[PDB]
Amino acid sequence: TTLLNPYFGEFGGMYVPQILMPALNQLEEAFVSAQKDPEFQAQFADLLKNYAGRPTALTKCQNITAGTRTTLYLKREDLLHGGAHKTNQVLGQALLAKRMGKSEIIAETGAGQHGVASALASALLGLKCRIYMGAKDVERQSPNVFRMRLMGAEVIPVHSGSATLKDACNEALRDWSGSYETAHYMLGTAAGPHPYPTIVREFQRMIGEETKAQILDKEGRLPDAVIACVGGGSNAIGMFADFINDTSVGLIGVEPGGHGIETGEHGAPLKHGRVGIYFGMKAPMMQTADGQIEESYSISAGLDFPSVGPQHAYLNSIGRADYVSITDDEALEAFKTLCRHEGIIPALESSHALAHALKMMREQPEKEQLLVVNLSGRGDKDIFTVHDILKARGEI
Amino acid sequence: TTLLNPYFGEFGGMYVPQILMPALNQLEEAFVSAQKDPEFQAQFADLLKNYAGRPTALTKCQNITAGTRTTLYLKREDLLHGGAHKTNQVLGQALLAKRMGKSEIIAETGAGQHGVASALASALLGLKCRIYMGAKDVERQSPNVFRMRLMGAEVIPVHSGSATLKDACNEALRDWSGSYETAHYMLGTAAGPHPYPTIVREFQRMIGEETKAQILDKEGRLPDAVIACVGGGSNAIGMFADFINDTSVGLIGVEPGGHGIETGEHGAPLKHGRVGIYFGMKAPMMQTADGQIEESYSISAGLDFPSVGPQHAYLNSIGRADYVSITDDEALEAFKTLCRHEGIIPALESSHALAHALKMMREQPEKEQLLVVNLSGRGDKDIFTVHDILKARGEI
Amino acid sequence: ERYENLFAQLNDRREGAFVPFVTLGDPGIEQSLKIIDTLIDAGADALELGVPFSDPLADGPTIQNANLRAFAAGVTPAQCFEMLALIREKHPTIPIGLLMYANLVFNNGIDAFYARCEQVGVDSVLVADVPVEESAPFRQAALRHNIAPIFICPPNADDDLLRQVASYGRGYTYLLSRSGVTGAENRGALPLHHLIEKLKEYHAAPALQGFGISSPEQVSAAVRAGAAGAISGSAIVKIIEKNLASPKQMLAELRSFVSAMKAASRA
Amino acid sequence: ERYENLFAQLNDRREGAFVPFVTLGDPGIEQSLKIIDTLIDAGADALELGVPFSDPLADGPTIQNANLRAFAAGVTPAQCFEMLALIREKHPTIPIGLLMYANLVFNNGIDAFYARCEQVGVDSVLVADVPVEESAPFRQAALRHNIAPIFICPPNADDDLLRQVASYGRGYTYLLSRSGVTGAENRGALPLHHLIEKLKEYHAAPALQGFGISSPEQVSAAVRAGAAGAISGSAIVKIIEKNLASPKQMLAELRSFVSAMKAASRA
Ligand SMILES: Cc1ncc(COP(=O)(O)O)c(/C=N/[C@H](Cc2c[nH]c3ccccc23)C(=O)O)c1O
Ligand SMILES: Cc1ncc(COP(=O)(O)O)c(/C=N/[C@H](Cc2c[nH]c3ccccc23)C(=O)O)c1O
Ligand SMILES: O=P(O)(O)OC[C@@H](O)CO
Ligand SMILES: O=P(O)(O)OC[C@@H](O)CO
Ligand code: NA
Ligand code: NA
């Protein structure tokens, strides 16, 4: 029995080993009580505003849309402390962890951004933080690993399977199975067992609430569509949530298409996978015919995850949100275009969302449309990845 | 003849080759006219707010000051687009460059932060940007060089002299001497010939104006002191300017002490140099007995400059502001302390200011005092420098 | 029903059940079949059998590597069901339980999975990542195909969960020795007499204790505390991995270990 | 006064002045003294002499490297003033001008610098990074020590600046050929007849054109336009650098080049 509905239609649930159900129930109760506690809301708001730097800007693109009837705004989560939206809900989960008497944090990361966020929040709030990272990503993201360790987190490379996010998620869950009395598992996206998809949404939904107020102030009307990348789901549900009941506003989620859907080397389970049970939830996932979990691929480590949060699966099923995919090469062109024409270096994750908005503008350049792209993070962490790609293509 | 006073007491002036005086006079007139133009002010404010992300947060330290009677706030210029205060006045100077009909930008950088700022503003506003950088700093700052080039700037390594900032300043001035008709020299600090010390102050002074409003809202009174690092002077004059007439508020500038003042390997001309004429101004500078300009040193490239802006020289001379120095090792300890205890990774430049505030707190732990440190930038650019230091000391 | 028959006999003989676990197809189909025949001949009262899964999130390194070995041999779930059918034809009375991950049960249809379990003669299914709160469609399909649904009693169980496990479970109750994942290196230390007695009060299926049981002394201790038996997996799998190059030394050492564990269950 | 005497003679002879520039002490004290004696003997009417400065921001690479060579020889300003005193003792009538950077003039005291210039017999000082707007203490100290303060007329000069340069300058006016820094590779192209004639209208000191003058054809052209002479530095310094290993081939080539440039100034 739960206080809140664990399912979004057929998707979601709490598919964890029995030993973890008390921890999930405790976390749900803590969250429900926190959402009614003005003292908790006041502390969370103070950290968001005065530590993380909310509200974030809403930037009108001046150059990218020249020659079209598209007006494009960028919601600047890249300007949050830590460099990505991840900081919003880590601060909320950390506060919940203290409300519950936990003194340790377990987290996993692939791009390193949620790891950086978990580490900074643990440093500020006095928690002992350990972070699992696919050993492959440990070598590609050694600067973010060092950041995490400078802020006092332990970083544990995972040599297993694809040596990427999924494999780090597994180890974090194994760890939590034997340390839940003292450690809070700080899940990094809007996925996993209930209550995490709900908690991450509610601790990210200021992104869409601010965007709505900002766009009404600047344009006097709601956007025609809001566009976000989808790895596990958090930044997109955060943008979407306040618009779900504004039925004129399109909701567009962008999955990574990798080298191309037809190559099988992608990260697009929502549109190209099959419903399964893993990660603690019932959700679309990339799997073999036999039901083994397949490895995903994306140029962007943060999108390289072979499942997707259940609320996105549900919003797709009913037609409220539309999901699309963007390939590595399209994401890379959009990264370069933003750098050169707006002076903003975007995360490669967010470059997928931008890339689809550029397509919407370029394919129909006489269509009048007001678009908002969630710029979920900055691309400082990606400049080495991008340099080695442009070096191998003779572009530089 | 000038519209504005070019001197701060005996310091400042316009000590440039005669051929450059028209360009300096034109720039002064453009600035004076801009400061009275509500259309210019409205455009500048829109870029600051909606592109760069002002106002920046004022963060109370929760952990660093435990066990003392010191209350410490950090003015979070690290959260500005680009990662440092530099973006504030580059956007103003870029707008001035367009007001004047210039289509190219010349700039110099040592840490790369002003280079990154110049490049992002030129990309946004449609200017052709070329950036001089000491070839030594080009190799240490190859990731920031790539950032600049990704945003479309040309980056020109300078193999000359100490191969650091001073040498890049020289080449930028030589370049400008032969291209001032089409190119605006975007000076990166509050130094150089008039009108630059005045323009950079007026385009940075929102830092102190916001701090004053924020601290009065949070504490009901002015700070006992505001503390900032001093390389050329911009971030500190930006913090100081609105408090200069609030005579109870201490103004503390922190120069780099390098390996120690007694070693001669420092960047502290204000307190340990001698008045000279170079860089277009009369100002304290590190020089030999014969008047040759000496090379400075700091662990932080952004403070590695053997002179200082004239208004700081003047504020020191009259006793309105006090200047001190912090060594590499003290800056490094303060960098580590902020990372581990507040979850903020500060620029090594700003780590000098923090380090002096920590000294003020630790030396007199029962002294009740309200301090504001200007956190001028984030330290992402410095994690490799810091890693190689901790690796050579067996600390990691 | 094979579990009821087993526990009735063991009760008569003043004995507890020793129940080895292995991963089907580890290190290969043929050696795995030989291994299981040896466990039985050496004294196993029942079997717990895993189907290799790509992401076994309740297993520590020993059983993770067993899965990897089965995959290196090409072991598929379809081949595992072929093995299960043969094992049942060899041993008509021994209870055969499966330890499954949810996706392998769900992804070609829950009902079809349990229908295939009935076709090959499986007696029970435990789904490691389906708590009792999510179990309805799994329970119903098990029961519809005459399969016992197994539920876990964790050491942090409360009374409401005891009553659910007692009411919904059949065959045996899985009594968890401790938190964490499988592994012989980590021995459970909490006393479980209180949970064991509550389960009996509520008429639960007989309890087998599992996780971290790797010595005869732990087997006798679970029986001394009231549990009807003990399961050991990692300890047995470690013998497989240690003897990969000597298939018959492996069976010899498996035989010796099982007999010693089953002996400790006697009385 | 040496400049007035020089220009009066050249005027009588229908001639313009050729004025070489070198960096004092480049490549060494002794060779620099030999170089200057050769420039004079080969036809130089006046001298412009630089004191090596650590950061010469009005100089391109050729003269930057001349400074570096002097520094590699240990050349200090004090040694340069010793050289200046000897040069004056050798050549009592030639005008000797210094091209200085401001810090070397200012940093032991402006007055003391010009007092030392008078002691050694310098006739004029140009301070490259002191515009006329900043020049008051420099002008006053020059005049107080019977030194001519030289001011630059840039090609972007306006009328107010023409009047200032005409009123405050003495000895000669420095007529800049173009924007940018020194260098023989970059030849000025703007016609300057208009500025030259304005300076004469305002009674300015006679104008010498400098920057990027490296051929006899440019010398005759500056004279044909009304200028009283031409200065060449980088072109001469390039001969020094090209012949560092052959000190006497260097003097030979210096001699040939100066005579050819001074010849072009004749008529
Ligand atoms: C800047 C940025 N933008 C977008 C995303 C996509 O995440 P989202 O779909 O949840 O909005 C990420 C993910 N970064 C992942 C975050 C993560 C941690 N654990 C996960 C498990 C599944 C999926 C994503 C994660 C990383 O740190 O590597 C990101 O760093
Ligand atoms: C993050 C940060 N904080 C503080 C400073 C100190 O500068 P300030 O004293 O003007 O407040 C810098 C300087 N960064 C220098 C800026 C610079 C450009 N040109 C200069 C000439 C002289 C002195 C500094 C500069 C760089 O980009 O390297 C900086 O990047
Ligand atoms: O591996 P261990 O720790 O023995 O646990 C038993 C398990 O493998 C089967 O349920
Ligand atoms: O070097 P150039 O270009 O000849 O310029 C003259 C200068 O060196 C002396 O005034
Ligand atoms: Na995904
Ligand atoms: Na300095």
Side-chain angles (χ1 to χ4, degrees):
Chain A
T1 60
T2 56
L3 299 172
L4 297 171
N5 184 351
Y7 282 90
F8 300 87
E10 83 160 306
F11 307 106
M14 306 170 77
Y15 292 90
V16 301
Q18 194 67 59
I19 189 67
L20 282 168
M21 291 292 286
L24 293 179
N25 294 315
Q26 181 194 39
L27 169 66
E28 187 197 46
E29 188 216 57
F31 171 73
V32 164
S33 168
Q35 288 298 79
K36 307 176 297 193
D37 184 356
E39 181 55 36
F40 179 97
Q41 293 309 314
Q43 186 163 12
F44 191 23
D46 178 55
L47 291 173
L48 287 171
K49 185 181 168 263
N50 294 315
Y51 181 71
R54 308 211 66 84
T56 62
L58 184 71
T59 302
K60 190 175 171 180
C61 293
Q62 313 293 331
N63 300 311
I64 271 185
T65 61
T68 80
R69 293 190 76 189
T70 299
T71 299
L72 181 58
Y73 287 84
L74 307 181
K75 176 63 167 163
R76 302 292 302 285
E77 292 305 291
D78 64 305
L79 304 176
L80 210 64
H81 177 50
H85 67 292
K86 301 298 183 182
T87 300
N88 298 312
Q89 72 97 17
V90 153
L91 292 169
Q93 278 203 60
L95 286 177
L96 283 184
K98 301 237 291 176
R99 188 188 188 77
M100 292 190 301
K102 309 284 180 203
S103 55
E104 310 175 341
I105 290 290
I106 299 158
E108 75 291 337
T109 187
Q113 276 289 153
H114 177 68
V116 163
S118 296
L120 71 83
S122 297
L124 178 63
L125 303 169
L127 312 169
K128 300 167 56 186
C129 178
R130 59 193 180 269
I131 302 162
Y132 289 99
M133 195 171 197
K136 170 258 172 294
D137 303 311
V138 176
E139 292 306 316
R140 170 164 61 185
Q141 315 283 16
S142 73
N144 269 357
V145 171
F146 186 68
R147 287 187 190 91
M148 297 177 211
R149 289 171 175 164
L150 279 172
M151 299 193 284
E154 169 177 9
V155 181
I156 301 161
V158 171
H159 315 277
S160 285
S162 39
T164 60
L165 195 34
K166 159 174 80 68
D167 312 293
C169 302
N170 294 344
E171 296 299 351
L173 199 72
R174 296 181 181 112
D175 186 334
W176 193 41
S177 306
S179 59
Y180 54 84
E181 291 186 348
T182 64
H184 170 70
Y185 176 29
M186 194 148 67
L187 223 173
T189 186
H194 177 80
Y196 285 101
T198 296
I199 292 174
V200 173
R201 178 197 70 233
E202 291 298 305
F203 286 175
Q204 291 287 2
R205 61 177 308 124
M206 66 281 301
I207 292 172
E209 289 169 352
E210 286 176 17
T211 302
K212 176 179 294 182
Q214 289 173 312
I215 197 77
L216 293 169
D217 177 60
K218 298 171 167 219
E219 296 290 338
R221 67 194 206 73
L222 297 175
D224 293 308
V226 302
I227 304 155
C229 67
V230 180
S234 62
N235 93 85
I237 206 70
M239 181 53 89
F240 297 172
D242 208 47
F243 295 113
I244 286 163
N245 293 349
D246 295 297
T247 54
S248 79
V249 179
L251 313 172
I252 301 164
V254 185
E255 299 187 285
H259 288 144
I261 300 300
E262 76 285 347
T263 74
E265 297 170 4
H266 59 81
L270 204 164
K271 295 314 289 298
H272 300 291
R274 194 159 60 81
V275 68
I277 298 168
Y278 193 64
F279 302 115
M281 56 178 179
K282 187 179 283 180
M285 57 191 57
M286 297 172 67
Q287 37 174 326
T288 70
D290 285 353
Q292 308 297 349
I293 309 303
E294 270 185 4
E295 300 172 2
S296 47
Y297 164 76
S298 175
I299 189 68
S300 58
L303 301 182
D304 195 351
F305 182 65
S307 191
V308 66
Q311 191 167 7
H312 289 293
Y314 174 68
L315 288 171
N316 179 60
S317 170
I318 67 170
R320 175 67 190 94
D322 297 321
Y323 299 79
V324 299
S325 64
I326 285 287
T327 68
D328 285 1
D329 281 352
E330 294 167 317
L332 281 172
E333 184 273 321
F335 174 101
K336 293 200 302 167
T337 290
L338 201 67
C339 290
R340 185 166 261 106
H341 297 291
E342 307 291 339
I344 306 166
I345 302 180
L348 282 176
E349 292 79 13
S350 327
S351 298
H352 289 72
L354 181 59
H356 181 70
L358 289 174
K359 184 181 297 193
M360 297 167 71
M361 160 188 95
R362 293 166 174 161
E363 290 186 350
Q364 304 187 306
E366 289 290 295
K367 184 185 188 181
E368 185 167 349
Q369 53 189 346
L370 173 66
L371 309 184
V372 178
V373 162
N374 199 16
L375 208 73
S376 60
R378 60 174 192 254
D380 299 44
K381 63 175 158 55
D382 294 310
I383 57 165
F384 304 118
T385 289
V386 173
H387 178 269
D388 294 352
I389 285 168
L390 302 189
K391 200 178 187 297
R393 298 195 175 166
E395 301 189 26
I396 55 86
Chain B
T1 60
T2 56
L3 299 172
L4 297 171
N5 184 351
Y7 282 90
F8 300 87
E10 83 160 306
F11 307 106
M14 306 170 77
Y15 292 90
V16 301
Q18 194 67 59
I19 189 67
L20 282 168
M21 291 292 286
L24 293 179
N25 294 315
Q26 181 194 39
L27 169 66
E28 187 197 46
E29 188 216 57
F31 171 73
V32 164
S33 168
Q35 288 298 79
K36 307 176 297 193
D37 184 356
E39 181 55 36
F40 179 97
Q41 293 309 314
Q43 186 163 12
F44 191 23
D46 178 55
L47 291 173
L48 287 171
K49 185 181 168 263
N50 294 315
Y51 181 71
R54 308 211 66 84
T56 62
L58 184 71
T59 302
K60 190 175 171 180
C61 293
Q62 313 293 331
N63 300 311
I64 271 185
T65 61
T68 80
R69 293 190 76 189
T70 299
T71 299
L72 181 58
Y73 287 84
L74 307 181
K75 176 63 167 163
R76 302 292 302 285
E77 292 305 291
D78 64 305
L79 304 176
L80 210 64
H81 177 50
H85 67 292
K86 301 298 183 182
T87 300
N88 298 312
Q89 72 97 17
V90 153
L91 292 169
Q93 278 203 60
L95 286 177
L96 283 184
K98 301 237 291 176
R99 188 188 188 77
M100 292 190 301
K102 309 284 180 203
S103 55
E104 310 175 341
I105 290 290
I106 299 158
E108 75 291 337
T109 187
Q113 276 289 153
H114 177 68
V116 163
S118 296
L120 71 83
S122 297
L124 178 63
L125 303 169
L127 312 169
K128 300 167 56 186
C129 178
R130 59 193 180 269
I131 302 162
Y132 289 99
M133 195 171 197
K136 170 258 172 294
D137 303 311
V138 176
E139 292 306 316
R140 170 164 61 185
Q141 315 283 16
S142 73
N144 269 357
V145 171
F146 186 68
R147 287 187 190 91
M148 297 177 211
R149 289 171 175 164
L150 279 172
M151 299 193 284
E154 169 177 9
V155 181
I156 301 161
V158 171
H159 315 277
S160 285
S162 39
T164 60
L165 195 34
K166 159 174 80 68
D167 312 293
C169 302
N170 294 344
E171 296 299 351
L173 199 72
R174 296 181 181 112
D175 186 334
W176 193 41
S177 306
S179 59
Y180 54 84
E181 291 186 348
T182 64
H184 170 70
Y185 176 29
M186 194 148 67
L187 223 173
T189 186
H194 177 80
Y196 285 101
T198 296
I199 292 174
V200 173
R201 178 197 70 233
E202 291 298 305
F203 286 175
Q204 291 287 2
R205 61 177 308 124
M206 66 281 301
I207 292 172
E209 289 169 352
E210 286 176 17
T211 302
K212 176 179 294 182
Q214 289 173 312
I215 197 77
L216 293 169
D217 177 60
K218 298 171 167 219
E219 296 290 338
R221 67 194 206 73
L222 297 175
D224 293 308
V226 302
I227 304 155
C229 67
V230 180
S234 62
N235 93 85
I237 206 70
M239 181 53 89
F240 297 172
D242 208 46
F243 295 113
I244 286 163
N245 293 349
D246 295 297
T247 54
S248 79
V249 179
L251 313 172
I252 301 164
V254 185
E255 299 187 285
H259 288 144
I261 300 300
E262 76 285 347
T263 74
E265 297 170 4
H266 59 81
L270 204 164
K271 295 314 289 298
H272 300 291
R274 194 159 60 81
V275 68
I277 298 168
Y278 193 64
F279 302 115
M281 56 178 179
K282 187 179 283 180
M285 57 191 57
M286 297 172 67
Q287 37 174 326
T288 70
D290 285 353
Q292 308 297 349
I293 309 303
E294 270 185 4
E295 300 172 2
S296 47
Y297 164 76
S298 175
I299 189 68
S300 58
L303 301 182
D304 195 351
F305 182 65
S307 191
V308 66
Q311 191 167 7
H312 289 293
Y314 174 68
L315 288 171
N316 179 60
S317 170
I318 67 170
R320 175 67 190 94
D322 297 321
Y323 299 79
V324 299
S325 64
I326 285 287
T327 68
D328 285 1
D329 281 352
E330 294 167 317
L332 281 172
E333 184 273 321
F335 174 101
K336 293 200 302 167
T337 290
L338 201 67
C339 290
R340 185 166 261 106
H341 297 291
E342 307 291 339
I344 306 166
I345 302 180
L348 282 176
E349 292 79 13
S350 327
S351 298
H352 289 72
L354 181 59
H356 181 70
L358 289 174
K359 184 181 297 193
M360 297 167 71
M361 160 188 95
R362 293 166 174 161
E363 290 186 350
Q364 304 187 306
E366 289 290 295
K367 184 185 188 181
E368 185 167 349
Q369 53 189 346
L370 173 66
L371 309 184
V372 178
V373 162
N374 199 16
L375 208 73
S376 60
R378 60 174 192 254
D380 299 44
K381 63 175 158 55
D382 294 310
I383 57 165
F384 304 118
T385 289
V386 173
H387 178 269
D388 294 352
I389 285 168
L390 302 189
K391 200 178 187 297
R393 298 195 175 166
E395 301 189 26
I396 55 86
Chain C
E1 199 282 316
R2 293 186 181 91
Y3 281 109
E4 297 164 18
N5 291 348
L6 172 59
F7 285 127
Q9 298 172 118
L10 294 173
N11 189 33
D12 297 6
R13 303 190 251 129
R14 271 184 176 275
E15 290 187 12
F18 179 57
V19 185
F21 162 99
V22 298
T23 293
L24 284 170
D26 170 28
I29 301 303
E30 281 178 297
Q31 181 71 16
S32 176
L33 286 171
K34 284 196 293 170
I35 284 158
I36 290 159
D37 284 355
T38 300
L39 306 174
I40 301 176
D41 185 61
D45 292 308
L47 296 183
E48 288 305 318
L49 298 175
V51 170
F53 183 50
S54 53
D55 293 87
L57 56 74
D59 288 308
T62 295
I63 288 168
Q64 285 172 39
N65 288 325
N67 282 245
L68 292 183
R69 289 195 291 277
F71 287 127
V75 174
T76 67
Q79 284 169 341
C80 290
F81 274 116
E82 290 175 35
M83 291 171 69
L84 290 169
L86 177 52
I87 293 167
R88 172 55 70 212
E89 295 162 26
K90 291 163 163 179
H91 305 280
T93 60
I94 187 158
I96 293 167
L98 302 189
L99 299 192
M100 297 300 305
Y101 283 95
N103 201 50
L104 291 181
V105 179
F106 170 85
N107 89 109
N108 285 358
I110 291 167
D111 185 76
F113 179 87
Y114 287 90
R116 184 83 180 111
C117 289
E118 183 186 22
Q119 179 176 22
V120 300
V122 165
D123 299 293
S124 69
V125 173
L126 183 163
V127 189
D129 51 341
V130 178
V132 70
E133 290 85 344
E134 293 284 6
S135 67
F138 299 87
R139 247 158 46 216
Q140 300 159 355
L143 291 170
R144 185 163 67 239
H145 293 284
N146 297 312
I147 302 304
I150 303 311
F151 291 105
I152 288 152
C153 180
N156 65 6
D158 63 2
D159 188 75
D160 215 322
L161 175 66
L162 290 172
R163 297 184 174 274
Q164 288 189 94
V165 160
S167 184
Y168 292 150
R170 306 275 184 280
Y172 73 90
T173 300
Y174 194 119
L175 188 75
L176 216 49
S177 305
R178 53 155 176 82
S179 61
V181 294
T182 65
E185 313 95 349
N186 173 11
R187 289 157 164 72
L190 188 76
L192 310 174
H193 303 71
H194 169 66
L195 300 176
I196 295 167
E197 278 299 353
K198 286 303 310 186
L199 289 165
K200 304 205 221 232
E201 183 192 322
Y202 296 151
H203 294 198
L208 306 173
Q209 180 174 334
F211 274 39
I213 282 171
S214 60
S215 62
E217 286 96 351
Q218 289 165 282
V219 179
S220 45
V223 168
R224 201 149 91 202
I231 301 158
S232 173
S234 293
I236 283 139
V237 175
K238 280 198 170 181
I239 306 180
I240 298 175
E241 71 175 349
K242 288 158 50 62
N243 291 280
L244 291 171
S246 52
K248 302 300 168 60
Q249 177 63 13
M250 179 201 296
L251 299 179
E253 292 205 335
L254 285 170
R255 174 175 294 275
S256 179
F257 178 75
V258 171
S259 57
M261 304 280 275
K262 171 59 200 174
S265 63
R266 297 207 168 88
Chain D
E1 199 282 316
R2 293 186 181 91
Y3 281 109
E4 297 164 18
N5 291 348
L6 172 59
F7 285 127
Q9 298 172 118
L10 294 173
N11 189 33
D12 297 6
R13 303 190 251 129
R14 271 184 176 275
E15 290 187 12
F18 179 57
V19 185
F21 162 99
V22 298
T23 293
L24 284 170
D26 170 28
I29 301 303
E30 281 178 297
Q31 181 71 16
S32 176
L33 286 171
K34 284 196 293 170
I35 284 158
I36 290 159
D37 284 355
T38 300
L39 306 174
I40 301 176
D41 185 61
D45 292 308
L47 296 183
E48 288 305 318
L49 298 175
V51 170
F53 183 50
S54 53
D55 293 87
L57 56 74
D59 288 308
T62 295
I63 288 168
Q64 285 172 39
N65 288 325
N67 282 245
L68 292 183
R69 289 195 291 277
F71 287 127
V75 174
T76 67
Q79 284 169 341
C80 290
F81 274 116
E82 290 175 35
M83 291 171 69
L84 290 169
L86 177 52
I87 293 167
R88 172 55 70 212
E89 295 162 26
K90 291 163 163 179
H91 305 280
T93 60
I94 187 158
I96 293 167
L98 302 189
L99 299 192
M100 297 300 305
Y101 283 95
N103 201 50
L104 291 181
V105 179
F106 170 85
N107 89 109
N108 285 358
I110 291 167
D111 185 76
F113 179 87
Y114 287 90
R116 184 83 180 111
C117 289
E118 183 186 22
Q119 179 176 22
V120 300
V122 165
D123 299 293
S124 69
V125 173
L126 183 163
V127 189
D129 51 341
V130 178
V132 70
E133 290 85 344
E134 293 284 6
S135 67
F138 299 87
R139 247 158 46 216
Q140 300 159 355
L143 291 170
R144 185 163 67 239
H145 293 284
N146 297 312
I147 302 304
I150 303 311
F151 291 105
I152 288 152
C153 180
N156 65 6
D158 63 2
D159 188 75
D160 215 322
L161 175 66
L162 290 172
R163 297 184 174 274
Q164 288 189 94
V165 160
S167 184
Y168 292 150
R170 306 275 184 280
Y172 73 90
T173 300
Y174 194 119
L175 188 75
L176 216 49
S177 305
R178 53 155 176 82
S179 61
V181 294
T182 65
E185 313 95 349
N186 173 11
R187 289 157 164 72
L190 188 76
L192 310 174
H193 303 71
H194 169 66
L195 300 176
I196 295 167
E197 278 299 353
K198 286 303 310 186
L199 289 165
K200 304 205 221 232
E201 183 192 322
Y202 296 151
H203 294 198
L208 306 173
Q209 180 174 334
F211 274 39
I213 282 171
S214 60
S215 62
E217 286 96 351
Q218 289 165 282
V219 179
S220 45
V223 168
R224 201 149 91 202
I231 301 158
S232 173
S234 293
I236 283 139
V237 175
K238 280 198 170 181
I239 306 180
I240 298 175
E241 71 175 349
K242 288 158 50 62
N243 291 280
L244 291 171
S246 52
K248 302 300 168 60
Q249 177 63 13
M250 179 201 296
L251 299 179
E253 292 205 335
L254 285 170
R255 174 175 294 275
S256 179
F257 178 75
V258 171
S259 57
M261 304 280 275
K262 171 59 200 174
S265 63
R266 297 207 168 88

